[PDB]
């Protein structure tokens, strides 16, 4: 959005004491975003764990599926012989 | 200082906090006038966009009603 | 609501430093109003998109209905021949 | 200035906030007294208006009950 | 509740520049009550409109019932003739 | 100016706000002492009212249970 | 309440200007407690009214019950005669 | 004034507000140090009570599970 | 956790009057932690009481079960004799 | 003061309040710059963590669709 760019340009023109205070404000918003990013990291880790679990359970069910299929084929072949 | 804001906005509430923290007489008056002019221009642009899309939505709604009524004619 | 006009009259009578301060305050409140404008613009944009997609769906349904009606009429005419 | 407030009103918590923030010694006292008197007068007028509206609503309610009773008599 | 009267008399005894600030906060509070009264007035207006529309509907049904009774009585009288 | 607020309260949150804003060294010390004594007495009287109503409620509830037991026995 | 006792001890030792401000703020918190007391006495009065109306209802039902019982006994005695 | 505080507390929120308000230079520094040490000691004691009750809860839960085990093994 | 240690290092470098204010504010934070601790204590005590009452109920039921089992065994033995 | 904070973090809201409170000109500027450097350094590290996690999510997701499609082809 152009509004933020215009505000940045206006404050840069204002600048050209203030620098240190602006940096302190950036520090405050940075620590707020530290908290936000920690929260999102935790949520994403939980999502990763859930996906991991569901994928191994899918693997286990498909391995039973293929084992049963092979057993059925073997029994049919034996009976046909 | 502006580079940090540029970084933080390329990353993605920040604008509101920055402008609130932004919130000698002659220079202050001149800067205030510049900010007011920029903001007024942006508001005028926003209102123009709003009215544009408002007539757009009105036309789309009337088109919907007309087509539905024609469909009911068809039955 | 005549309160705004009365307040304007009282402020103008009081006025005739402070002007710059009140301009700064109205600037801040304007900055606040900008976010309301943004929220409105976003919600109406989603509304516009939904209206558009509904338009195309009804377009397609009407086209299919008309095609079916024409096919039925042609079949009846062919049988009557 | 006041032109911004005029634009805001004709465009129709923003106005509430600006009037809250807007709100030597002798002039200040005189202005405060005038504001307080104007506010009190307008408050009295609003009280009168709401009293009239309440009386009208009560009368309409009683008319409603009376006519419903008449209808039940008719049946 | 007599506590407010006791507070008023105690503050009057205390008083006998501060008066101007007291009046300032007083009209601020009365401005808040102005907003409250505006809201109450609007809600009462909505209630009045609802009362009017329900009265209109009741008038319609009453007229229907009266007319119906009239033609029933007239038909009975004609049959008696 | 106090009489104006008295008229406002008798016309109908106001008390809390006016008391919060209500809150010279010797004068303020004496007035604070007086108001603290007044509030202490008022709070003691309120506590007496609380105990009165509480014992009344307890007695009424006990009578209710005893009389309900009477009713169940009689049936 | 050990924290309260120890804090009181520490404050009294520190004190022995302060007293006036402390008693002013305790005046304010007593005002808050007064508001709390108003709320609780109101709710308790409502409970009292409810209890009274239940008492009245039980009175009426017991009166009807005993009247009916006496009437049934009288009818049985009359039949037995 | 502390007597009023203790009387109010023994009469029944107040403690938290008064302690947040409560919190010669050397005297005040020493008083602050003493208060901080007292608070740290009380926090340690509270943590001790926490571990006591947690051990109690763990023991009760294990006994519960064991007794349910024998209950279901009874048949 | 490491970020906290690094911040502690930086501020120990800076500070090594402000120390007293930092101590005061840490005292306030810990006095809030006191209320947190009290809430945890109360909740865990309630949990312990509930566990104890459940224990008592289960003791009752197990005693009845054992008594019934012994009675049935004795009855069977009497019949067998 | 730092010992109390490190003890309390070893025990495991605290850091949020502490950093909100903590956050002559030359020393102030130097300490501020050091803080900025450290904070932005582990900011960049955390973004690296985010991107690696997103890559992991994409890989796991596509592996999931592949195995589900294999299941569907199995029958």
XYZ file of C-alpha atoms in Angstrom:
780
model
C 0.000 0.000 0.000
C 1.244 3.482 -0.869
C 0.115 5.058 2.407
C 2.894 3.432 4.446
C 5.471 4.422 1.823
C 4.220 8.017 1.882
C 4.393 8.085 5.686
C 7.938 6.687 5.573
C 8.946 9.340 3.033
C 7.391 12.117 5.123
C 9.172 11.018 8.294
C 12.468 10.620 6.420
C 12.053 14.190 5.167
C 11.304 15.250 8.750
C 14.534 13.617 9.936
C 16.567 15.340 7.220
C 17.919 12.274 19.366
C 15.038 11.293 17.091
C 16.970 8.305 15.725
C 17.430 6.660 19.128
C 13.765 7.095 20.085
C 12.595 5.680 16.748
C 14.935 2.718 17.228
C 13.498 2.180 20.718
C 9.988 2.132 19.241
C 11.172 -0.395 16.650
C 12.587 -2.430 19.545
C 9.181 -2.469 21.235
C 7.338 -3.575 18.115
C 10.108 -6.133 17.542
C 9.589 -7.748 20.948
C 5.838 -7.813 20.338
C 6.540 -9.674 17.108
C 8.901 -11.959 19.055
C 5.920 -13.016 21.157
C 3.727 -13.417 18.063
C 6.364 -15.502 16.276
C 6.857 -17.760 19.302
C 3.119 -18.424 19.321
C 3.015 -19.260 15.626
C 6.072 -21.530 16.004
C 4.313 -23.519 18.725
C 1.132 -23.859 16.661
C 3.083 -24.978 13.593
C 5.005 -27.564 15.626
C 1.730 -29.045 16.876
C 0.472 -29.192 13.284
C 3.661 -30.996 12.238
C 3.167 -33.586 14.977
C -0.415 -34.237 13.888
C 0.581 -34.680 10.250
C 3.407 -37.024 11.257
C 1.039 -39.223 13.280
C -1.609 -39.435 10.574
C 0.986 -40.349 7.944
C 2.409 -43.279 9.900
C -1.091 -44.581 10.646
C -1.889 -44.382 6.924
C 1.304 -46.332 6.223
C 0.316 -49.036 8.714
C -3.205 -49.438 7.323
C -1.926 -49.639 3.745
C 0.628 -52.299 4.703
C -2.153 -54.423 6.201
C -4.130 -53.819 2.995
C -1.354 -55.079 0.719
C -0.582 -58.048 2.990
C -4.222 -59.119 2.876
C -4.290 -58.751 -0.904
C -1.198 -60.938 -1.283
C -2.660 -63.577 1.040
C -5.885 -63.676 -0.982
C -3.955 -64.057 -4.238
C -1.864 -66.883 -2.777
C -4.937 -68.740 -1.508
C -6.679 -68.387 -4.874
C -3.598 -69.657 -6.718
C -3.262 -72.613 -4.341
C -6.919 -73.583 -4.765
C -6.690 -73.242 -8.552
C -3.680 -75.587 -8.648
C 15.201 3.899 10.648
C 12.981 3.694 7.577
C 14.905 0.621 6.403
C 13.728 -1.306 9.469
C 10.104 -0.447 8.665
C 10.678 -1.518 5.052
C 12.108 -4.834 6.265
C 9.239 -5.392 8.695
C 6.578 -4.674 6.076
C 8.287 -6.892 3.487
C 8.157 -9.581 6.194
C 4.357 -9.755 5.994
C -0.662 -3.397 13.188
C 2.871 -2.127 12.569
C 1.648 0.920 10.635
C -0.820 1.911 13.361
C 1.807 1.655 16.101
C 4.408 3.540 14.052
C 2.037 6.385 13.182
C 0.766 6.590 16.771
C 4.335 6.840 18.066
C 5.004 9.551 15.476
C 2.082 11.492 16.984
C 10.599 24.088 16.404
C 7.071 25.346 15.753
C 7.651 26.224 12.087
C 9.177 22.898 11.027
C 6.533 21.005 13.007
C 3.774 22.994 11.290
C 5.260 22.332 7.845
C 5.571 18.591 8.502
C 2.008 18.485 9.851
C 0.784 20.249 6.703
C 2.610 17.751 4.477
C 1.141 14.786 6.366
C -2.342 16.317 6.191
C -2.096 16.858 2.440
C -0.897 13.313 1.782
C -3.606 11.828 3.997
C -6.352 13.944 2.408
C -5.271 12.844 -1.061
C -5.288 9.201 -0.003
C -8.757 9.575 1.549
C -10.072 11.116 -1.668
C -8.636 8.180 -3.620
C -10.248 5.734 -1.178
C -13.645 7.408 -1.562
C -13.302 7.303 -5.341
C -12.561 3.582 -5.226
C -15.498 3.012 -2.865
C -17.987 4.774 -5.127
C -16.615 2.997 -8.219
C -17.125 -0.447 -6.727
C -20.461 0.623 -5.219
C -21.919 1.296 -8.653
C -20.200 -1.915 -9.780
C -22.005 -3.942 -7.104
C -25.318 -2.232 -7.875
C -24.967 -3.136 -11.547
C -24.027 -6.725 -10.741
C -27.033 -7.085 -8.427
C -29.391 -5.705 -11.078
C -27.877 -8.096 -13.631
C -28.490 -10.983 -11.220
C -32.126 -9.987 -10.729
C -32.694 -9.539 -14.471
C -31.165 -12.907 -15.360
C -33.093 -14.717 -12.621
C -36.337 -13.128 -13.801
C -35.550 -14.172 -17.384
C -34.923 -17.714 -16.135
C -38.322 -17.654 -14.416
C -39.764 -16.463 -17.734
C -38.140 -19.478 -19.390
C -39.891 -22.006 -17.131
C -27.819 16.206 15.317
C -26.906 19.834 15.962
C -24.172 19.065 18.493
C -21.429 19.189 15.846
C -22.493 22.642 14.647
C -22.718 24.012 18.194
C -19.270 22.636 19.043
C -17.863 24.176 15.851
C -19.415 27.533 16.746
C -18.022 27.408 20.287
C -14.540 26.485 19.050
C -14.555 29.267 16.447
C -15.688 31.778 19.077
C -12.925 30.624 21.434
C -10.263 30.855 18.715
C -11.379 34.338 17.660
C -0.241 27.246 18.901
C -3.642 25.782 19.756
C -4.497 25.547 16.051
C -1.464 23.355 15.358
C -2.303 21.079 18.300
C -5.932 20.612 17.255
C -4.775 19.945 13.682
C -2.399 17.280 15.008
C -5.217 15.674 17.002
C -7.594 15.662 14.028
C -4.729 14.166 11.995
C -4.452 11.319 14.496
C -8.193 10.670 14.502
C -8.125 10.704 10.684
C -5.378 8.077 10.829
C -7.728 6.054 13.015
C -10.558 6.423 10.481
C -8.280 5.054 7.744
C -8.415 1.558 9.275
C -12.223 1.582 9.295
C -12.081 2.515 5.614
C -9.710 -0.404 4.961
C -11.954 -2.909 6.728
C -14.982 -1.713 4.779
C -13.108 -1.958 1.476
C -11.959 -5.517 2.197
C -15.390 -6.819 3.203
C -17.107 -5.274 0.185
C -14.414 -6.726 -2.090
C -15.183 -10.232 -0.824
C -18.894 -9.511 -1.310
C -18.204 -8.470 -4.913
C -16.283 -11.684 -5.603
C -19.100 -13.824 -4.212
C -21.696 -11.964 -6.268
C -19.614 -12.470 -9.411
C -19.198 -16.223 -8.939
C -22.928 -16.588 -8.258
C -23.519 -14.714 -11.522
C -21.424 -17.175 -13.527
C -23.088 -20.191 -11.909
C -26.564 -18.941 -12.806
C -25.334 -18.133 -16.322
C -24.257 -21.739 -16.828
C -27.474 -23.157 -15.367
C -29.602 -20.996 -17.671
C -27.544 -22.054 -20.697
C -28.045 -25.746 -19.908
C -31.779 -25.240 -19.351
C -32.207 -23.465 -22.694
C -30.216 -26.139 -24.532
C -32.359 -28.891 -23.027
C -35.567 -27.073 -23.940
C -34.438 -26.630 -27.548
C -33.468 -30.305 -27.792
C -36.875 -31.378 -26.468
C -38.688 -29.119 -28.940
C -36.629 -30.436 -31.857
C -37.244 -34.055 -30.843
C -40.994 -33.456 -30.596
C -41.042 -31.755 -34.001
C -39.079 -34.623 -35.558
C -41.461 -37.208 -34.091
C -44.517 -35.259 -35.263
C -43.150 -35.194 -38.829
C -9.722 23.302 11.764
C -13.521 23.321 11.891
C -13.707 22.620 8.146
C -12.559 19.054 8.827
C -15.429 18.590 11.289
C -17.824 20.046 8.708
C -16.537 17.578 6.112
C -16.886 14.732 8.618
C -20.504 15.564 9.450
C -21.526 16.128 5.822
C -19.842 12.836 4.879
C -22.661 11.052 6.738
C -16.813 7.393 17.839
C -14.627 9.604 15.650
C -16.617 12.765 16.361
C -16.990 11.726 20.003
C -13.214 11.376 20.323
C -12.483 14.718 18.659
C -15.012 16.582 20.814
C -13.733 14.817 23.941
C -10.176 15.934 23.196
C -11.313 19.439 22.230
C -13.059 19.827 25.600
C -6.212 33.618 30.494
C -8.254 32.240 33.387
C -11.191 34.602 32.804
C -11.617 33.743 29.119
C -11.332 30.017 29.849
C -13.945 30.298 32.604
C -16.328 32.222 30.339
C -15.982 29.699 27.506
C -16.472 26.777 29.905
C -19.585 28.422 31.360
C -21.055 29.006 27.894
C -20.373 25.401 26.863
C -21.922 24.058 30.070
C -25.032 26.210 29.688
C -25.543 25.208 26.055
C -25.113 21.538 26.957
C -27.582 21.775 29.850
C -30.192 23.479 27.673
C -29.858 20.893 24.918
C -30.062 18.134 27.550
C -33.313 19.588 28.883
C -34.697 19.687 25.339
C -33.687 16.051 24.776
C -35.371 15.058 28.049
C -38.553 16.763 26.891
C -38.395 15.007 23.524
C -37.925 11.564 25.073
C -40.810 12.249 27.469
C -43.072 13.112 24.528
C -42.009 9.940 22.720
C -42.669 7.794 25.802
C -46.131 9.314 26.240
C -46.915 8.662 22.571
C -45.781 5.038 22.879
C -47.901 4.542 26.005
C -50.963 5.974 24.270
C -50.450 3.746 21.239
C -50.094 0.716 23.521
C -53.360 1.507 25.315
C -55.099 1.964 21.959
C -53.722 -1.439 20.931
C -55.145 -3.147 24.016
C -58.506 -1.382 23.694
C -58.923 -2.332 20.034
C -57.860 -5.929 20.717
C -60.469 -6.118 23.485
C -63.056 -4.734 21.059
C -62.078 -7.427 18.551
C -62.481 -10.123 21.206
C -65.914 -8.669 21.978
C -66.805 -8.888 18.281
C -65.883 -12.581 18.041
C -29.525 6.823 48.690
C -28.421 9.743 50.856
C -24.687 9.264 50.310
C -24.625 11.669 47.358
C -26.158 14.448 49.466
C -23.515 13.889 52.150
C -20.774 14.046 49.519
C -22.290 17.244 48.099
C -22.445 18.982 51.478
C -18.915 17.852 52.369
C -17.551 19.187 49.076
C -19.434 22.471 49.517
C -17.853 22.772 52.965
C -14.465 22.022 51.386
C -14.950 24.792 48.816
C -15.985 27.282 51.500
C -9.874 27.754 39.767
C -11.099 24.391 41.041
C -14.678 25.410 40.216
C -13.825 25.809 36.522
C -12.296 22.320 36.316
C -15.284 20.910 38.205
C -17.641 22.471 35.650
C -15.442 21.135 32.835
C -15.680 17.555 34.082
C -19.391 18.108 34.757
C -20.166 19.000 31.157
C -17.972 16.119 29.992
C -20.107 13.707 32.016
C -23.236 15.399 30.672
C -21.864 14.901 27.141
C -21.566 11.189 27.871
C -25.153 11.202 29.107
C -26.081 13.068 25.906
C -24.767 10.110 23.919
C -26.680 7.726 26.196
C -29.910 9.686 25.709
C -29.402 9.731 21.934
C -29.168 5.945 21.940
C -32.260 5.608 24.117
C -34.227 7.970 21.857
C -33.304 5.986 18.743
C -34.323 2.690 20.358
C -37.637 4.206 21.464
C -38.244 5.434 17.907
C -37.700 1.897 16.609
C -40.182 0.596 19.191
C -42.703 3.216 18.043
C -42.329 2.099 14.421
C -42.893 -1.532 15.400
C -46.003 -0.571 17.355
C -47.336 1.322 14.334
C -46.845 -1.606 11.955
C -48.455 -4.132 14.310
C -51.401 -1.754 14.725
C -51.715 -1.624 10.932
C -51.794 -5.425 10.663
C -54.393 -5.659 13.434
C -56.529 -3.093 11.600
C -56.394 -5.223 8.447
C -57.504 -8.387 10.221
C -60.251 -6.560 12.149
C -61.687 -5.134 8.928
C -61.593 -8.589 7.336
C -63.453 -10.124 10.284
C -66.101 -7.388 10.391
C -66.772 -7.626 6.655
C -67.033 -11.414 6.871
C -69.535 -11.280 9.720
C -71.541 -8.761 7.698
C -71.893 -10.950 4.620
C -72.662 -14.012 6.755
C -75.505 -12.163 8.480
C -76.790 -10.875 5.135
C -76.774 -14.384 3.642
C -78.636 -15.736 6.672
C -81.242 -12.975 6.362
C -81.655 -13.671 2.640
C -82.158 -17.375 3.362
C -84.763 -16.524 6.005
C -86.676 -14.491 3.399
C -22.052 23.457 40.818
C -22.958 20.573 43.119
C -26.661 21.467 42.995
C -26.588 20.908 39.227
C -25.405 17.330 39.740
C -28.014 16.916 42.494
C -30.714 17.951 40.026
C -29.222 15.582 37.446
C -29.277 12.601 39.816
C -32.804 13.332 41.048
C -33.911 13.650 37.412
C -33.232 9.949 36.793
C -23.020 5.695 37.040
C -23.112 9.423 37.765
C -22.322 8.936 41.462
C -19.256 6.786 40.775
C -17.825 9.270 38.272
C -18.472 12.355 40.406
C -16.981 10.674 43.481
C -13.935 9.491 41.522
C -13.285 12.986 40.169
C -13.999 14.573 43.564
C -10.863 12.926 44.958
C -4.660 23.749 51.315
C -2.798 20.978 53.143
C -4.571 21.433 56.485
C -7.944 21.904 54.783
C -7.537 18.779 52.655
C -6.343 16.770 55.666
C -9.382 17.777 57.724
C -11.825 17.164 54.868
C -10.313 13.747 54.117
C -10.596 12.837 57.802
C -14.253 13.906 57.863
C -15.180 12.026 54.688
C -13.337 8.912 55.885
C -15.267 8.961 59.157
C -18.536 9.455 57.277
C -17.816 6.546 54.945
C -16.770 4.308 57.849
C -20.070 4.990 59.597
C -22.050 4.466 56.395
C -20.274 1.155 55.730
C -20.989 -0.003 59.283
C -24.675 0.823 58.799
C -24.689 -1.036 55.471
C -23.156 -4.088 57.160
C -25.895 -3.904 59.780
C -28.463 -3.840 56.982
C -26.777 -6.878 55.410
C -26.904 -8.893 58.623
C -30.542 -7.885 59.180
C -31.628 -9.047 55.731
C -29.507 -12.206 55.998
C -31.079 -13.293 59.283
C -34.505 -12.466 57.834
C -33.801 -14.677 54.812
C -32.530 -17.502 57.025
C -35.651 -17.381 59.186
C -37.976 -17.295 56.185
C -36.189 -20.257 54.590
C -36.391 -22.250 57.831
C -40.115 -21.517 58.084
C -40.508 -22.597 54.452
C -38.809 -25.952 55.039
C -40.706 -26.619 58.280
C -44.058 -25.751 56.691
C -43.287 -27.883 53.630
C -42.520 -30.767 55.995
C -45.889 -30.106 57.638
C -47.592 -30.238 54.238
C -45.886 -33.513 53.318
C -46.841 -35.045 56.675
C -50.475 -33.950 56.342
C -50.896 -35.451 52.860
C -3.551 -13.491 56.009
C 0.131 -13.735 56.895
C 1.066 -11.598 53.898
C -1.299 -8.879 55.129
C 0.163 -8.971 58.642
C 3.760 -8.842 57.411
C 3.005 -6.032 54.949
C 1.279 -4.058 57.714
C 4.319 -4.592 59.946
C 6.716 -3.409 57.234
C 4.588 -0.365 56.378
C 4.240 0.657 60.031
C 7.993 0.307 60.566
C 8.730 2.328 57.419
C 6.331 5.097 58.468
C 7.742 5.160 62.001
C 2.491 13.381 54.599
C 2.271 9.608 54.207
C -0.838 9.240 56.367
C -2.905 11.828 54.481
C -2.382 10.258 51.049
C -2.795 6.737 52.440
C -6.099 7.609 54.111
C -7.284 9.425 50.967
C -6.700 6.321 48.861
C -8.286 4.115 51.518
C -11.248 6.514 51.278
C -11.440 5.795 47.554
C -11.267 2.033 48.009
C -13.966 2.309 50.689
C -16.127 4.076 48.094
C -15.579 1.109 45.784
C -16.536 -1.250 48.603
C -19.683 0.848 49.116
C -20.649 0.224 45.492
C -20.073 -3.503 46.047
C -22.279 -3.350 49.153
C -25.056 -1.657 47.177
C -24.966 -4.452 44.615
C -25.059 -7.229 47.193
C -27.881 -5.675 49.230
C -29.942 -5.264 46.052
C -29.529 -8.909 45.039
C -30.278 -10.069 48.591
C -33.474 -7.992 48.661
C -34.541 -9.656 45.409
C -33.914 -13.067 46.989
C -36.002 -12.011 50.000
C -38.930 -11.047 47.764
C -38.738 -14.388 45.963
C -38.738 -16.282 49.254
C -41.785 -14.310 50.402
C -43.779 -15.142 47.272
C -42.941 -18.847 47.595
C -44.127 -18.670 51.212
C -47.438 -17.187 50.055
C -47.945 -19.910 47.440
C -47.259 -22.646 49.985
C -49.738 -20.986 52.358
C -52.494 -21.113 49.757
C -51.818 -24.727 48.780
C -51.725 -25.957 52.390
C -55.025 -24.187 53.089
C -56.713 -25.852 50.115
C -55.259 -29.246 51.067
C -56.484 -29.134 54.666
C -59.924 -27.888 53.597
C -60.248 -30.790 51.170
C -59.132 -33.298 53.797
C -61.688 -32.015 56.308
C -64.449 -32.131 53.690
C -63.589 -35.731 52.792
C -63.623 -36.747 56.458
C -67.006 -35.067 56.947
C -68.462 -36.830 53.901
C -67.168 -40.198 55.114
C -68.648 -39.614 58.574
C -71.997 -38.615 57.060
C -72.067 -41.748 54.897
C -71.170 -43.937 57.884
C -74.117 -42.502 59.846
C -3.992 3.680 58.825
C -2.866 0.053 58.690
C -5.350 -0.742 61.465
C -8.140 0.297 59.096
C -6.653 -2.051 56.490
C -6.521 -5.032 58.846
C -10.033 -4.317 60.152
C -11.390 -4.149 56.597
C -9.640 -7.382 55.609
C -10.841 -9.225 58.724
C -14.334 -7.805 58.144
C -15.071 -9.987 55.102
C -9.318 -7.542 45.998
C -8.452 -4.985 48.684
C -5.059 -6.534 49.458
C -3.890 -6.580 45.835
C -4.924 -2.975 45.199
C -3.402 -1.633 48.413
C -0.125 -3.507 47.890
C 0.105 -2.353 44.269
C -0.432 1.221 45.461
C 2.075 0.918 48.314
C 4.885 -0.232 46.015
C 15.283 9.045 53.579
C 16.543 7.544 50.317
C 18.738 5.002 52.115
C 15.895 4.168 54.507
C 13.572 3.491 51.570
C 16.230 1.383 49.831
C 16.647 -0.749 52.958
C 12.869 -1.095 53.336
C 12.588 -2.183 49.692
C 15.342 -4.759 50.227
C 13.595 -6.163 53.309
C 10.247 -6.340 51.495
C 11.829 -8.117 48.526
C 13.533 -10.666 50.773
C 10.306 -11.344 52.670
C 8.414 -11.830 49.409
C 11.054 -14.221 48.052
C 10.935 -16.289 51.239
C 7.146 -16.483 51.126
C 7.276 -17.532 47.457
C 9.707 -20.312 48.374
C 7.343 -21.466 51.127
C 4.416 -21.476 48.688
C 6.446 -23.593 46.266
C 7.078 -25.982 49.149
C 3.347 -26.283 49.790
C 2.892 -26.862 46.047
C 5.293 -29.799 46.062
C 3.629 -31.209 49.193
C 0.173 -31.201 47.621
C 1.502 -32.517 44.298
C 3.089 -35.490 46.063
C -0.190 -36.062 47.911
C -2.157 -35.963 44.648
C 0.219 -38.391 42.928
C -0.032 -40.843 45.817
C -3.822 -40.627 45.876
C -4.020 -41.207 42.114
C -1.747 -44.258 42.264
C -3.753 -45.721 45.154
C -6.968 -45.071 43.208
C -5.674 -46.897 40.132
C -4.354 -49.833 42.173
C -7.617 -50.246 44.079
C -9.627 -50.131 40.848
C -7.289 -52.812 39.493
C -8.088 -55.122 42.403
C -11.783 -54.203 42.072
C -11.881 -55.398 38.468
C -9.743 -58.435 39.328
C -12.163 -59.408 42.118
C -14.604 -61.161 39.772
C 15.558 -19.013 27.342
C 18.920 -18.142 25.818
C 17.543 -14.809 24.623
C 16.622 -14.001 28.232
C 20.175 -14.807 29.336
C 21.642 -12.629 26.582
C 19.358 -9.721 27.507
C 20.390 -10.163 31.148
C 24.034 -10.054 30.039
C 23.505 -6.866 28.025
C 21.686 -5.076 30.839
C 24.269 -6.204 33.399
C 26.860 -4.651 31.090
C 24.819 -1.438 30.943
C 24.043 -1.139 34.661
C 27.291 -2.606 36.005
C 19.372 4.364 41.213
C 17.973 2.375 38.293
C 18.760 -0.843 40.177
C 16.343 0.105 42.967
C 13.541 0.809 40.478
C 14.187 -2.516 38.733
C 14.029 -4.239 42.127
C 10.735 -2.486 42.908
C 9.127 -3.525 39.627
C 10.356 -7.118 39.990
C 8.808 -7.017 43.466
C 5.496 -6.007 41.899
C 5.702 -8.774 39.303
C 6.398 -11.328 42.033
C 3.538 -9.995 44.168
C 1.273 -10.730 41.206
C 2.894 -14.161 41.002
C 1.785 -14.513 44.637
C -1.873 -14.307 43.585
C -1.193 -16.744 40.748
C 0.306 -19.128 43.313
C -2.721 -18.787 45.600
C -5.068 -19.650 42.742
C -3.027 -22.729 41.860
C -3.029 -23.807 45.523
C -6.810 -23.513 45.789
C -7.468 -25.409 42.555
C -5.138 -28.258 43.505
C -6.646 -28.506 47.000
C -10.104 -28.835 45.441
C -8.780 -31.566 43.143
C -7.333 -33.411 46.149
C -10.658 -33.248 48.005
C -12.507 -34.648 44.993
C -9.976 -37.461 44.689
C -10.428 -38.302 48.379
C -14.218 -38.511 48.126
C -13.927 -40.741 45.047
C -11.547 -42.958 47.032
C -14.136 -43.250 49.803
C -16.919 -44.216 47.382
C -14.745 -46.885 45.768
C -13.853 -48.277 49.198
C -17.565 -48.582 49.973
C -18.378 -50.424 46.755
C -15.428 -52.820 47.025
C -16.432 -53.716 50.584
C -19.975 -54.531 49.458
C -18.635 -56.621 46.566
C -16.317 -58.660 48.798
C -19.057 -59.238 51.376
C -21.459 -60.453 48.695
C -18.856 -62.789 47.211
C -18.118 -64.334 50.607
C -21.834 -64.761 51.322
C -22.398 -66.523 47.993
C -19.441 -68.839 48.605
C -20.741 -69.710 52.078
C -24.220 -70.415 50.698
C -22.773 -72.710 48.028
C -20.700 -74.542 50.643
C -23.783 -74.995 52.835
C -25.754 -76.411 49.901
C -22.910 -78.782 49.006
C -22.725 -80.173 52.558
C 18.356 -7.961 40.169
C 19.512 -10.206 37.331
C 19.963 -13.087 39.780
C 16.269 -12.960 40.692
C 15.232 -13.031 37.028
C 17.549 -15.933 36.203
C 16.270 -17.815 39.269
C 12.666 -17.242 38.190
C 13.364 -18.408 34.636
C 15.211 -21.433 36.049
C 12.015 -22.173 37.997
C 10.297 -22.922 34.677
C 4.478 -13.639 31.455
C 7.585 -12.782 33.484
C 9.743 -11.990 30.454
C 6.997 -9.961 28.768
C 6.581 -7.640 31.758
C 10.323 -7.422 32.459
C 11.186 -6.532 28.859
C 8.276 -4.084 28.710
C 9.640 -2.268 31.765
C 13.330 -2.238 30.821
C 12.603 -1.093 27.257
C 23.815 9.490 29.338
C 22.875 9.685 25.660
C 26.028 7.938 24.407
C 25.718 4.903 26.688
C 21.989 4.739 25.939
C 22.676 4.724 22.193
C 25.397 2.069 22.460
C 23.279 -0.269 24.594
C 20.313 0.280 22.270
C 22.422 -0.640 19.233
C 23.700 -3.800 20.936
C 20.126 -4.783 21.814
C 19.022 -4.201 18.215
C 21.856 -6.335 16.881
C 21.082 -9.277 19.159
C 17.322 -9.067 18.636
C 17.522 -8.873 14.842
C 20.059 -11.705 14.806
C 17.760 -14.167 16.472
C 14.844 -12.657 14.526
C 16.611 -13.828 11.370
C 17.295 -17.185 13.028
C 13.595 -17.552 13.876
C 12.612 -16.772 10.283
C 15.023 -19.492 9.182
C 13.234 -21.835 11.571
C 9.876 -20.781 10.092
C 10.967 -21.438 6.511
C 12.477 -24.823 7.393
C 9.235 -25.761 9.158
C 7.176 -24.710 6.132
C 9.361 -26.861 3.882
C 8.819 -29.776 6.274
C 5.054 -29.201 6.163
C 5.033 -29.202 2.361
C 7.068 -32.409 2.179
C 4.855 -34.201 4.694
C 1.692 -33.032 2.921
C 2.794 -34.204 -0.531
C 3.943 -37.524 0.932
C 0.466 -37.863 2.456
C -1.341 -37.251 -0.843
C 1.002 -39.683 -2.582
C 0.274 -42.458 -0.070
C -3.474 -41.777 -0.222
C -3.367 -42.026 -4.018
C -1.471 -45.310 -3.695
C -4.219 -46.539 -1.359
C -6.833 -45.581 -3.945
C -4.946 -47.373 -6.729
C -4.544 -50.445 -4.505
C -8.180 -51.545 -4.819
